[PDB]
Amino acid sequence: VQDALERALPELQQALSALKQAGGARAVGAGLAEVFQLVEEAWLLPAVGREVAQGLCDAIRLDGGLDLLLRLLQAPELETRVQAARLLEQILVAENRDRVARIGLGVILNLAKEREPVELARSVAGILEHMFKHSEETCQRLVAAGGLDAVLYWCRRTDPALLRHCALALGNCALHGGQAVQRRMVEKRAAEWLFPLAFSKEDELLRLHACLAVAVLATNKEVEREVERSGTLALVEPLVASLDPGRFARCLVDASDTSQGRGPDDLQRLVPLLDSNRLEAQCIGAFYLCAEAAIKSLQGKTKVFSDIGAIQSLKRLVSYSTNGTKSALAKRALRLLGEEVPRPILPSVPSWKEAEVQTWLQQIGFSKYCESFREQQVDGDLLLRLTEEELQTDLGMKSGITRKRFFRELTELKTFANYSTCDRSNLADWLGSLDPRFRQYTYGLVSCGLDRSLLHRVSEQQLLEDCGIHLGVHRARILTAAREML
Amino acid sequence: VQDALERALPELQQALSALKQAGGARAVGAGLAEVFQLVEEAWLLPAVGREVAQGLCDAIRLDGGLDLLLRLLQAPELETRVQAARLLEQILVAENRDRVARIGLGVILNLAKEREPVELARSVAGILEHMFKHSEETCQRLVAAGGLDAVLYWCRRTDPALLRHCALALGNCALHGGQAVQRRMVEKRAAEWLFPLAFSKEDELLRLHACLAVAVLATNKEVEREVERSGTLALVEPLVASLDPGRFARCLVDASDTSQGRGPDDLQRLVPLLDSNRLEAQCIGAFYLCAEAAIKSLQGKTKVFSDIGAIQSLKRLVSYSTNGTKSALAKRALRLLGEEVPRPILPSVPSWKEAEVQTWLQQIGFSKYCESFREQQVDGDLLLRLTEEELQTDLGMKSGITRKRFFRELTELKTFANYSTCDRSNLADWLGSLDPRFRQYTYGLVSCGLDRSLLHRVSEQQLLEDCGIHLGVHRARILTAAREML
Ligand SMILES: NC(=O)c1ccc[n+]([C@@H]2O[C@H](COP(=O)(O)O)[C@@H](O)[C@H]2O)c1
Ligand SMILES: NC(=O)c1ccc[n+]([C@@H]2O[C@H](COP(=O)(O)O)[C@@H](O)[C@H]2O)c1
């Protein structure tokens, strides 16, 4: 409904005109307070708050509002500077951020150099946290300047809002920033600086943000060991298992800085954490996704989770996981969205009998082919070695699209299977080290007698014909990794 | 209707004969005024104006009119010179344009060196603006002479007509002139001289012309950064969102110099702006096309927009855009033409389910194949990897022409899709940097595991068989770009 937007925009235009007509500090402050009140009311509006606040932010984007606020932020009087930053913190949506990045970068960097004032420090922390979510080159230039060191410095204060903003900034730059940024931060010692925040006990939100930042940093293998040595990473898993997503979701809605929740593009960034191969990362990602699902289901906008790929990852995590806390979090999140909860698939595929194959077929939605699979007595050994011709002629999958879907399911089963009963040289982990999506080839190599001590003598033709590696890219990568003597 | 033409020609011939019989300044001026009054009466004629004035121009082209006017323009007396230039400004249609370029170029260049007179300067500005629309070699020779410097020099005056003519000339040379001319102008500092014109407030038409010129200059990436640093470019988008195309279209019709609008070849040059990849360029192009549509629909000549490819571009811009001002302008322009407005297509193709595919199929006009697609359960993942054989055998597109049409649609969907859920190494932007028509290949590479850090080791056979790049030209270009270490 745009009725709130239609009502609010006249008032916003009048306030902007008055601010443009403000020739002194008093009028400037009055106009800034008026516009801040107008935008805050929209940000706290139930259900339609985001759209009817992005509308006013877009309006301010036009009419020269952003440039006027920046110029006021350059004003000699700090009393106006603080209010200008206060308003600039609550408007930096993507459309209002790209302009600031093109124009307003640098001036804010220099302004951040005043590390003494508390209100200015808080507002500037807001600006930086909301700015680190721009393209990775913006992160490069921000870290090159004193922004990263500045937030590093503010980390040692006590007022809660500044610490929470610093933690949010650290998480945002850990996520959006590139691998170089994360390595740079680790060399900056930023991982160790978060330990007091995570171990603190004043607020649970600050601890959650610190754990998120440290986990996202730890996902990167290049610096995983030193990050773990900080000791804060081990504090992640115990924290999530105790907190309740509903209570954590009940919060973030009584507050104003997050009353409306998390956007579609900030949820896209968290989804990969469910695929991070790191237990703490998956746990914290599942916790955050559960909280955001709790918020959005109340907002009645759960469709976003489908467009992001979160439901698929949650179902896969439920199926192919052995831990308890992350499985429970994923199951609760799936139930919140009103989606089904897959039953766990026992991982020892090579030791599967007919019944297991029938159950798996019924799970993946190929129940039309249960009779054909049962007639031919396809078991785990015969399933892991199935081919296109055997699918087409013997099992009866004539349509090539259906066969592609079946192989798409079987590749996920292969990647997330357990080959302990087959490979005694632990060849699955070596393949997973290069790229996790190479773990599907374990059974291909193992059944041919290959081991870690025989790989360096293999050839591309043997991999193509005997081990059944079809894609040339994977063949070349495996050969290059093997010819370096494992 | 040629009745106006048939009436007008006898008078034009009598006036031309009288001018040829003019032996002094007074008779020359009288004949020039008569012919000027005649051509102007035709130019301001509703609906048929353009044709019945082009006929008078062809009449003048023959009978030695153009050579006579040029010789008068060489007359020692400036009183006759100004009128000769005044009449030469209003007759330079393409047929009358090429002749002057072959013959009358150079003399006009020298005459332009009279920077002091106001009337002569105005007429020369008109001549130069209407001449810069000749082949790019004519632009090269004009810039080599003092024409570009002369117009930049007149840009610093105040009389409105001269400034408007200079802005129009600069826009015309930016559009018709080659990339070398644009680079030359940027090095000439031509971008910066436009800032006062765009920031002016006396007339909105001058600001619009300056914004058009600067945007067309900025489309060229080689000089985009320095052009943006001028500061005028950022003033483009705020301007269009406030002006009304109808009022702007209502103007340019009360004026004689544009009473008839823009021609079929001056619109073909604006249409490429909708594909410029620059937000300001697309916004200004959409605004201009909307204004011209408003004019031509009143003239009842909207067919031209189909012959130019403007409707296809407008529909594509409406479908695959996220901005508000340009989308609104495109929708209004489409509605003026009496054409349909496509509903937006959500860009996250990889995350599509069956319903999204059915909607897309119904949009593109392949609703006859909805049942076949639904039966085979084609979704975004299977849609982005569809082939000729699967289309033919499994889905049932027997006619090769229909399959070519379908792939024509799918390639546009692929280029304008959002692969954020797939590519964490942001490989789409690298492909789009070489040529935007390569962004279609993103999902082809990504699904094979390739990244920016693995491209330099790929081979042509891998790009052909695995990544599915059929055209050899694109394969060679991609390999050459990758082997230079990204
Ligand atoms: N994301 C929210 O729930 C929320 C709530 C209230 C205000 N805001 C403001 O919105 C801006 C950030 O917008 P997005 O992060 O949604 O792009 C900031 O100025 C912030 O202060 C966001
Ligand atoms: N394009 C118009 O709407 C228009 C209107 C009146 C006169 N003219 C004259 O026609 C000539 C340009 O012709 P075209 O723009 O059709 O190529 C110039 O001499 C100009 O003064 C053009």
Side-chain angles (χ1 to χ4, degrees):
Chain A
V1 59
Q2 64 277 7
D3 296 331
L5 189 61
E6 297 285 7
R7 193 268 296 177
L9 281 182
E11 294 189 353
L12 183 63
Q13 295 298 338
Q14 178 175 349
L16 274 172
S17 57
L19 187 65
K20 188 66 169 55
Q21 295 172 12
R26 195 73 164 278
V28 159
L32 290 174
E34 283 191 3
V35 295
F36 184 86
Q37 197 276 352
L38 294 162
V39 74
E40 282 316 290
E41 179 184 0
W43 275 122
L44 275 72
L45 180 56
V48 285
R50 165 160 295 273
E51 310 170 53
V52 307
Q54 216 276 336
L56 282 72
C57 289
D58 289 9
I60 294 171
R61 167 173 58 97
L62 281 67
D63 301 332
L66 181 58
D67 181 81
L68 183 63
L69 270 296
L70 188 153
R71 180 156 47 80
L72 294 174
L73 173 141
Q74 299 178 198
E77 300 297 339
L78 63 86
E79 289 78 354
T80 59
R81 285 205 294 261
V82 294
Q83 306 188 49
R86 178 184 189 80
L87 187 48
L88 196 148
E89 186 266 329
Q90 298 284 345
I91 54 151
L92 289 166
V93 302
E95 293 177 350
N96 298 83
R97 188 185 309 162
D98 61 358
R99 294 178 65 88
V100 175
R102 284 187 306 161
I103 297 167
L105 188 153
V107 65
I108 62 182
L109 275 44
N110 288 58
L111 188 153
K113 209 59 64 183
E114 314 178 29
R115 303 166 175 194
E116 307 85 17
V118 64
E119 181 64 25
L120 192 71
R122 171 194 317 158
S123 297
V124 172
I127 308 307
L128 282 71
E129 66 182 1
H130 270 107
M131 191 65 52
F132 275 126
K133 308 188 315 201
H134 188 266
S135 296
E136 55 179 313
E137 63 90 21
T138 299
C139 293
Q140 293 177 335
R141 66 181 53 179
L142 294 174
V143 64
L148 178 56
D149 318 305
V151 292
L152 295 174
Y153 190 69
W154 278 301
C155 293
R156 306 137 210 182
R157 300 288 182 268
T158 59
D159 60 356
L162 169 56
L163 277 296
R164 172 152 51 261
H165 287 60
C166 295
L168 291 160
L170 286 169
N172 290 342
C173 57
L175 278 165
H176 297 70
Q179 186 173 175
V181 176
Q182 299 178 351
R183 189 189 305 173
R184 178 64 180 86
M185 294 180 183
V186 181
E187 299 297 347
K188 170 59 71 168
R189 205 171 164 184
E192 301 189 19
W193 288 115
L194 284 160
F195 177 84
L197 307 176
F199 185 64
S200 63
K201 303 181 181 176
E202 286 79 3
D203 293 357
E204 64 268 26
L205 272 55
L206 176 63
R207 307 175 69 190
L208 290 162
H209 299 343
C211 295
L212 176 65
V214 68
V216 182
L217 282 195
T219 188
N220 188 48
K221 62 176 185 300
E222 275 175 345
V223 301
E224 65 193 1
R225 307 171 195 83
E226 53 189 354
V227 171
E228 185 176 10
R229 295 277 73 82
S230 305
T232 180
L233 191 62
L235 186 54
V236 171
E237 180 178 333
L239 171 60
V240 308
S242 57
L243 308 168
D244 184 2
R247 276 70 171 272
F248 174 56
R250 180 63 59 93
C251 180
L252 295 174
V253 178
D254 304 354
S256 66
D257 291 331
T258 78
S259 172
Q260 286 298 320
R262 194 173 288 240
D265 188 356
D266 298 355
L267 287 176
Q268 173 65 57
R269 288 280 170 173
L270 293 173
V271 168
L273 292 180
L274 305 182
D275 291 331
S276 178
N277 282 249
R278 185 82 184 176
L279 170 60
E280 302 88 8
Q282 302 172 353
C283 288
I284 190 65
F287 185 76
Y288 267 126
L289 284 178
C290 184
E292 298 293 347
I295 299 171
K296 304 274 181 174
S297 196
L298 188 153
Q299 292 182 18
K301 182 175 73 175
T302 62
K303 185 79 178 61
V304 65
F305 279 86
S306 71
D307 306 348
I308 297 161
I311 297 169
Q312 299 279 311
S313 296
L314 289 173
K315 286 182 176 176
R316 160 160 60 255
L317 186 67
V318 169
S319 291
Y320 299 110
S321 70
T322 59
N323 194 302
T325 185
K326 78 182 194 175
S327 288
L329 289 171
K331 287 194 289 184
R332 181 166 177 183
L334 277 177
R335 279 196 289 270
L336 268 186
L337 280 71
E339 298 281 307
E340 65 177 351
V341 175
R343 292 181 295 103
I345 292 171
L346 73 165
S348 65
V349 177
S351 297
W352 271 7
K353 288 139 77 181
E354 285 82 1
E356 272 95 338
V357 178
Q358 304 305 118
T359 305
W360 173 74
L361 283 181
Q362 294 175 16
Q363 281 195 18
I364 62 153
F366 276 72
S367 45
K368 171 179 171 185
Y369 298 86
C370 291
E371 190 67 14
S372 173
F373 264 77
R374 184 199 65 80
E375 176 212 344
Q376 300 282 303
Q377 292 171 285
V378 171
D379 63 333
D381 181 63
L382 293 175
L383 188 73
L384 291 178
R385 294 184 301 166
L386 200 64
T387 44
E388 196 92 14
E389 47 268 7
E390 299 181 29
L391 259 179
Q392 181 177 5
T393 55
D394 299 317
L395 297 163
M397 272 189 198
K398 306 178 188 310
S399 37
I401 300 165
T402 305
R403 294 199 299 274
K404 291 174 65 175
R405 292 168 50 206
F406 179 86
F407 280 124
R408 197 176 58 181
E409 306 288 340
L410 188 71
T411 288
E412 183 177 348
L413 180 68
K414 284 182 184 162
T415 56
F416 291 90
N418 185 34
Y419 309 108
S420 65
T421 71
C422 299
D423 66 2
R424 305 168 308 270
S425 64
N426 201 302
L427 180 55
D429 299 345
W430 176 84
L431 284 156
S433 78
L434 300 191
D435 185 358
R437 76 164 64 188
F438 290 174
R439 197 184 146 97
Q440 48 170 328
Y441 298 122
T442 308
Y443 204 73
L445 279 63
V446 174
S447 83
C448 296
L450 295 176
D451 279 354
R452 291 209 207 198
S453 58
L454 305 176
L455 269 172
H456 55 273
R457 281 190 295 105
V458 76
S459 58
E460 198 144 343
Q461 199 64 40
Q462 298 174 26
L463 286 176
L464 167 53
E465 300 180 346
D466 303 333
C467 316
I469 300 186
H470 297 287
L471 282 72
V473 186
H474 299 168
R475 286 198 308 262
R477 282 207 63 185
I478 291 169
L479 287 185
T480 289
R483 271 176 155 73
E484 296 170 12
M485 295 301 250
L486 282 294
Chain B
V1 58
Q2 64 276 3
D3 296 332
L5 190 62
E6 296 284 8
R7 194 268 296 177
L9 286 175
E11 295 191 356
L12 183 63
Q13 296 300 340
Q14 177 174 348
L16 275 170
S17 58
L19 186 64
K20 189 68 169 55
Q21 294 173 11
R26 194 72 163 278
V28 160
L32 291 175
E34 283 190 3
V35 295
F36 183 85
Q37 196 277 353
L38 291 180
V39 69
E40 287 318 291
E41 182 184 3
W43 269 122
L44 274 76
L45 185 57
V48 279
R50 175 161 275 284
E51 304 172 48
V52 307
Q54 216 276 345
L56 271 45
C57 288
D58 299 7
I60 294 173
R61 171 167 56 95
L62 282 66
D63 303 331
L66 182 60
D67 182 80
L68 183 63
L69 270 296
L70 188 153
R71 178 157 47 81
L72 295 174
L73 174 141
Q74 301 179 198
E77 299 298 339
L78 59 88
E79 288 75 356
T80 60
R81 276 205 296 260
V82 294
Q83 306 187 46
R86 178 185 188 81
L87 183 63
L88 190 65
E89 189 275 331
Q90 300 279 334
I91 62 170
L92 275 164
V93 295
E95 293 177 350
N96 296 93
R97 187 176 307 159
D98 63 358
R99 293 178 65 88
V100 178
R102 283 190 305 160
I103 296 168
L105 188 153
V107 72
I108 61 182
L109 276 45
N110 291 39
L111 181 157
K113 210 60 63 183
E114 307 184 43
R115 299 167 169 193
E116 308 85 16
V118 65
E119 182 64 25
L120 192 68
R122 172 193 317 158
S123 297
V124 170
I127 301 285
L128 294 174
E129 66 183 1
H130 276 118
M131 185 63 56
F132 263 123
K133 303 190 312 199
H134 190 261
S135 296
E136 55 179 274
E137 63 90 21
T138 299
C139 293
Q140 293 177 335
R141 67 178 52 178
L142 294 174
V143 62
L148 176 50
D149 304 313
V151 294
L152 295 174
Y153 178 81
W154 286 287
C155 293
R156 307 143 204 183
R157 300 288 182 268
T158 58
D159 60 356
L162 183 63
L163 277 297
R164 172 152 52 261
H165 287 62
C166 287
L168 289 157
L170 287 167
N172 290 345
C173 67
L175 279 167
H176 297 69
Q179 186 173 175
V181 176
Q182 298 180 356
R183 189 188 304 174
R184 178 64 180 86
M185 295 177 70
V186 179
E187 299 297 348
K188 170 59 70 167
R189 207 168 166 185
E192 298 192 20
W193 291 110
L194 295 174
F195 177 84
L197 307 176
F199 185 64
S200 62
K201 303 182 182 175
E202 287 79 2
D203 292 358
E204 65 270 23
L205 273 53
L206 177 64
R207 307 175 68 188
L208 289 157
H209 296 345
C211 292
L212 173 63
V214 67
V216 182
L217 277 191
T219 188
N220 172 247
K221 62 175 185 300
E222 279 174 344
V223 301
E224 65 194 1
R225 307 172 193 84
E226 53 189 355
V227 170
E228 185 175 11
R229 294 278 73 82
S230 306
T232 179
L233 191 63
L235 187 54
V236 170
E237 180 181 333
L239 170 61
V240 308
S242 56
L243 308 167
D244 184 3
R247 277 70 171 273
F248 176 62
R250 180 63 59 86
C251 182
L252 294 174
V253 175
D254 305 355
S256 65
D257 292 29
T258 78
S259 175
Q260 294 300 320
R262 201 167 290 240
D265 194 2
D266 300 347
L267 281 175
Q268 170 70 48
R269 289 272 174 176
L270 295 174
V271 167
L273 286 175
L274 302 178
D275 291 331
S276 178
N277 283 250
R278 184 84 184 177
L279 170 59
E280 303 89 14
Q282 302 174 348
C283 288
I284 189 61
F287 185 75
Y288 263 112
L289 285 176
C290 183
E292 300 291 353
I295 296 171
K296 303 275 184 170
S297 195
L298 188 153
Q299 285 178 13
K301 183 169 71 172
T302 63
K303 185 74 179 60
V304 66
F305 285 86
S306 67
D307 302 7
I308 298 161
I311 289 172
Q312 301 283 310
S313 294
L314 288 174
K315 288 185 177 174
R316 161 165 53 252
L317 186 68
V318 170
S319 279
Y320 301 107
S321 71
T322 62
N323 192 301
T325 185
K326 80 182 193 175
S327 288
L329 291 171
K331 285 193 288 182
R332 182 167 178 185
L334 278 179
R335 279 196 290 270
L336 288 174
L337 274 43
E339 290 279 324
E340 66 172 1
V341 175
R343 292 181 295 103
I345 293 171
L346 73 165
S348 67
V349 177
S351 299
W352 272 5
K353 290 138 74 181
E354 286 83 1
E356 274 95 328
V357 176
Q358 304 303 116
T359 302
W360 173 73
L361 281 180
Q362 295 175 14
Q363 281 197 30
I364 63 157
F366 279 72
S367 50
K368 171 180 171 186
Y369 297 87
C370 277
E371 190 69 14
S372 177
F373 269 69
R374 184 198 65 80
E375 177 211 345
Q376 302 282 303
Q377 291 172 285
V378 179
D379 59 338
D381 186 61
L382 297 172
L383 190 71
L384 294 176
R385 298 185 300 169
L386 202 65
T387 49
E388 198 91 8
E389 49 267 9
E390 300 180 35
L391 259 180
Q392 177 173 9
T393 56
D394 297 314
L395 296 161
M397 278 193 190
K398 303 172 193 315
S399 44
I401 298 161
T402 298
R403 292 195 304 276
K404 291 174 65 175
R405 292 172 53 210
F406 181 86
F407 280 123
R408 198 173 59 176
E409 305 287 346
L410 188 69
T411 285
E412 177 174 350
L413 181 70
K414 281 180 180 166
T415 58
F416 287 92
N418 178 31
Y419 311 106
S420 66
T421 76
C422 300
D423 66 9
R424 297 172 312 272
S425 64
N426 199 303
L427 182 57
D429 299 346
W430 176 83
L431 285 163
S433 76
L434 304 191
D435 190 9
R437 82 163 62 188
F438 290 169
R439 198 188 147 97
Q440 48 171 323
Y441 294 133
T442 307
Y443 199 75
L445 277 60
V446 159
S447 67
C448 300
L450 296 177
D451 269 5
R452 290 209 205 197
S453 60
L454 310 179
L455 270 173
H456 55 273
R457 277 190 298 102
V458 73
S459 56
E460 201 148 349
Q461 207 63 38
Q462 298 175 27
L463 285 180
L464 169 51
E465 305 178 344
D466 303 323
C467 309
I469 301 186
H470 297 291
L471 282 72
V473 186
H474 297 183
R475 283 198 308 270
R477 282 206 64 187
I478 288 169
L479 285 184
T480 289
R483 270 176 155 72
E484 296 170 13
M485 299 306 255
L486 281 293

